[PDB]
Scaffold this active site. Structure first.
Site, PDB file in Angstrom:
ATOM      1  N   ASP A   1      -3.417 -35.364   7.183  1.00  0.00           N
ATOM      2  CA  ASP A   1      -2.185 -35.069   6.463  1.00  0.00           C
ATOM      3  C   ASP A   1      -1.160 -36.130   6.859  1.00  0.00           C
ATOM      4  OD1 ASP A   1       0.708 -33.688   6.981  1.00  0.00           O
ATOM      5  OD2 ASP A   1      -0.207 -32.841   5.171  1.00  0.00           O
TER       6      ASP A   1
ATOM      7  N   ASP B   1      -2.537   5.534  10.462  1.00  0.00           N
ATOM      8  CA  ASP B   1      -1.360   5.291  11.291  1.00  0.00           C
ATOM      9  C   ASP B   1      -0.581   6.590  11.529  1.00  0.00           C
ATOM     10  OD1 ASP B   1      -0.620   1.951   9.950  1.00  0.00           O
ATOM     11  OD2 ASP B   1      -1.589   2.521  11.864  1.00  0.00           O
TER      12      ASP B   1
ATOM     13  N   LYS C   1       0.794  -1.217   0.000  1.00  0.00           N
ATOM     14  CA  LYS C   1       0.000   0.000   0.000  1.00  0.00           C
ATOM     15  C   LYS C   1       0.830   1.272   0.000  1.00  0.00           C
ATOM     16  CE  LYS C   1      -2.231  -0.943   3.790  1.00  0.00           C
ATOM     17  NZ  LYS C   1      -1.501   0.348   4.014  1.00  0.00           N
TER      18      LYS C   1
ATOM     19  N   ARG D   1       8.697  -6.736  10.139  1.00  0.00           N
ATOM     20  CA  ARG D   1       8.212  -5.361  10.191  1.00  0.00           C
ATOM     21  C   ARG D   1       8.641  -4.588  11.444  1.00  0.00           C
ATOM     22  NH1 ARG D   1       3.622  -3.466   8.401  1.00  0.00           N
ATOM     23  NH2 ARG D   1       3.747  -1.576   7.106  1.00  0.00           N
TER      24      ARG D   1
HETATM   25 CA   LIG Z   1       2.496 -31.792   7.149  1.00  0.00          CA
END
Ligand SMILES: [Ca+2]
Ligand SMILES: Nc1ncnc2c1ncn2[C@@H]1O[C@H](COP(=O)(O)OP(=O)(O)O)[C@@H](O)[C@H]1O
Ligand SMILES: Nc1ncnc2c1ncn2[C@@H]1O[C@H](COP(=O)(O)OP(=O)(O)O)[C@@H](O)[C@H]1O
Ligand SMILES: Nc1ncnc2c1ncn2[C@@H]1O[C@H](COP(=O)(O)OP(=O)(O)O)[C@@H](O)[C@H]1O
Ligand SMILES: Nc1ncnc2c1ncn2[C@@H]1O[C@H](COP(=O)(O)OP(=O)(O)O)[C@@H](O)[C@H]1O
Ligand SMILES: [Ca+2]
Ligand SMILES: [Ca+2]
Ligand SMILES: [Ca+2]
Lengths: 287, 287, 287, 287
Positions: C165, C35, C15, C126
């Site tokens: 999984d 901000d 942005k 950040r």
């Molecule tokens: Ca995995």
């Protein structure tokens, strides 16, 4: 005897802030740090991220000991040096001592034991000097091995149980369907269910107000075939993290062979796994 | 042959930015820098200012050569190292070579010659990594001794003269009283007056429009008993700094024994003194 | 017509970097950001963290619209303004338009859709401008509602199943005991088990090398009563995140009413929950 | 009555640091600042330098008053606001008051008077937030007009004199040729020479040790036809800057019509010009 202080702490534990103030007050003291050397040989800037390489690590290591030698072989003005790293690697930590004796120097340790919750708190705001959670986690796990803190591992004789949490896990902070099913599936399976909670038991005026509310909901609405329940004592303001880990070693671990932990708050899931209990996190719990 | 590149430049000349990009493209190259070492042994932060001390400098020096040795005694993978300092001290620069030969290594120099005006421009915005003007000045004065640039010192035979500037000095960019008096006081005294100016002579269509205007005002209004006048050639866009320093070596220095310089623009007063001509600055000239 | 560009993106999506380069190229354009206003009224420094307060938010909001009015009521020189926030709140986004029409201005949206994995990647580095995961998560969840991306919710008719999984979940990237038990507990319970994996199926020369290995281990060693199995197609280099979320909508969601997801890799657990599937994470999976 | 505090100080005088701590202690107080607004509308980063433009200034001004209105028209919770700029422009400063009365608000001033020497000291380390010396100088010159500090301008009746400095000016901190000539050239010309010095007069045990040494060298070796001499009193540790500016108003200004100042130390040349005395700087004097 000229000394070599090793700072023992995880990333963002205070190490450096300490060594600066200290050296700033104690003449004859100089600093030695890996990150510095790592950044320097690469000519990196603050926003650049170094890339691990044995060849470079070897060079850095090389730079430390040599600098140690150099400075420590100074006048009587030089009182010692600080090796301001994490120094959580025993293999190396030993190496510094065996190096220190073969030159006439002693070794000291300045420990910076900061709580995990607070280490994350800081490392996330650390910006470019921040470090990945698995390394932070891995690091803390060594800080515990250093401190000699306990790690669980079954308990022969006692029954095989699964500890459950209420707020967020069993309940939707009404019933949280799948998870409540699980508590009974494990109920059939032949497991003892030990519900647990960090909800303060009650208020100063009524020290079980909430404990009773909980127990009622757990039994009457959810219908969890619990065998035992534990909660945060009234007037206890320590961390959920700290709190449950005490309840474990004092009530469950002794009367139980724990196989699982169903929970939802990261700091707690983090604690469970960290000490030796497998923990499945049923929902996001970043709070 | 493994090489030891020395970067030759003043603070904020590009040195480091170069050594990072370079190492980032040329495998087998590592960086060595004093400032880094200086900050590290003190455990300093970005906003902290190190304090010069022989004892520390000695340690730092110690750290460089040792690191040079260490890394350069690596495999065939190590192609060389960069000593990214100012390296404007000949005494030391020599030392690195005599060190290099006694180990089988060659020495190279990567020069970063940036104009003074641009060095100030940068150093003022450098923030906490900025350096005092006298050091910056002192540094540049060594960068010139290195490049072998000329420094003036009288001219036997030719008359004793005093160079004067117009814009701001002789004129109030109407007449600037005290200074114009001076030009004549020196006129009595037995000095040749050589007025000079960085005002472009004129326009492409009329290459002396302003030169004539100037000369007229200088003679007719101010009444300066000049003996010679020089100005910036039409269509010249180089710096005032660069400009006058050429006019000197090409017209005045040869036909004159210069004793003084009356001016007002810092970059120019800076240039005058820098080459060997005393210069009195008559007004603030930061532009 | 003077325009009001709203940037639509999560924290650290580009942005601001966009609005600076843009304004730097398009004259007549000015920036408006919360901000900034937030930090300014508090006189905060970069290392200070603002504290949410309705009273302040109200003031900030107040500041934006007023500035919009002010600047946009400038000359014909003013081409428009950028409201460089996250603008992921529909309630407000609407407000800007209804505000724009009642003054003769149009509204445009510049979208910055960056992948979650990459948003975390950035937000963690950040530093002080970083934001908590739940807000980042909450934000992304709005960025998806904006884009109109799909969110699952059962499938009437199809059987109730639980997706599993392999790498890290079913297997200890030998068998991972408790989790494999679960797959069968759910097997008794009356659930369909749909094992899934992000392990590339195989190599260009043999596009199922690993798929077969997996299926074999899953059936023969673990003994998971799977009903269906899906894996990452050979020669697919997209993210695990992206990968499985496609396998879902294309194979499982249509033939199944999903109730649970047992996994271990955060980006994947993040994806599961995000789209509407409950997911229990069985181990740390920060990689 | 709701108040509008204006901070009166030069760049890097404390203004902002004050307004943050203050607001941090006094609820109901909010900040308004130009630089912030300036950076925000341009979407600039810390390393970017804004470019002055009437159009933008107009917008910024616009933003302040509007924000003032907005916030100050808040509840009884809002106690007031801080306009944390330099506010050294009387034209505008007046504007805020006349604005304040036409709305029922009072205006207060919080002054941050920091010494020039200290302002430079700070501004040079200010990095990217630093400001050019002429603006800093220009600013301080307004801070003085505000405080109502004195600016000299001849003295009718008294003789026309030229003040001279010793250390660095008359002497090469042996005689400094050209400058000593000048003192006599002005001697012929019909001027009174008033030598002056910031060299402490002497030691506690002998409060004129150095004053005598100086006077002797000035008369006997240099041969300066001085008419009067002044020096820093023994046991005085204030700044050279402060020191001479007192000696002026107390001894010279009253008995003399000053036309020139020959000196060498910037802070002093800075002071001379600043108060109304022309000053030619004969050498670099950055110390
Ligand atoms: Ca995995
Ligand atoms: C951040 O990270 C740096 C090091 O912080 P600190 O946590 O005190 O030391 P360390 O990370 O070495 O334990 C500081 O500059 C601080 O502002
Ligand atoms: C400033 O100062 C640092 C060094 O800049 P540079 O001038 O390129 O190198 P050097 O000062 O070593 O010659 C950079 O981080 C830049 O952003
Ligand atoms: C970090 O965070 C700031 C904003 O980065 P960016 O991700 O591009 O914008 P935004 O967070 O507004 O989407 C930059 O200064 C960058 O270096
Ligand atoms: C530098 O400059 C910023 C403003 O500093 P300060 O001098 O106290 O205020 P101001 O420049 O507004 O008078 C701070 O972040 C400081 O670290
Ligand atoms: Ca919980
Ligand atoms: Ca000039
Ligand atoms: Ca002096």
């Amino acid at each position: 005897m000229k000394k070599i202080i090793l700072t023992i702490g995880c990333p963002g534990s205070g190490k450096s802030t300490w060594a600066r103030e200290f050296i700033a007050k104690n003449p004859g003291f100089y600093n030695i740090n890996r990150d510095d050397y790592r950044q320097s040989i690469m000519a990196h800037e603050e926003r650049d991220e170094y890339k691990y390489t044995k060849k470079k690590e070897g060079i850095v290591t090389g730079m430390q000991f040599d600098t140690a030698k150099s400075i420590l072989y100074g006048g009587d003005s030089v009182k010692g040096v600080i090796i301001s790293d994490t120094n959580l690697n025993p293999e190396r930590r030993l190496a510094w001592e065996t190096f220190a004796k073969e030159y006439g120097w002693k070794v000291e340790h300045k420990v910076f034991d900061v709580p995990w919750t607070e280490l994350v708190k800081r490392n996330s705001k650390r910006g470019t000097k921040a470090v990945p959670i698995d390394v932070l986690r891995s690091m803390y796990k060594s800080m515990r091995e250093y401190l000699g803190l306990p790690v669980y591992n079954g308990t022969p004789g006692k029954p095989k149980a699964v500890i459950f949490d209420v707020d967020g896990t069993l309940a939707k902070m009404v019933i949280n369907p799948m998870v409540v099913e699980l508590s009974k599936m494990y109920a059939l399976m032949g497991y003892q269910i030990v519900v647990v909670s960090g909800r303060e038991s009650g208020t100063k005026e009524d020290p079980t107000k909430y404990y009773r509310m909980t127990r009622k909901w757990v039994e009457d609405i959810a219908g969890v075939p619990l065998v035992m329940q534990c909660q945060r004592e009234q007037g206890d303001t320590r961390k959920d993290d700290v709190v449950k880990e005490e309840i474990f070693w004092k009530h469950i671990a002794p009367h139980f062979d724990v196989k699982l932990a169903i929970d939802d708050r990261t700091q707690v899931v983090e604690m469970w796994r960290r000490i030796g209990v497998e923990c499945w996190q049923v929902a996001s719990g970043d709070f």
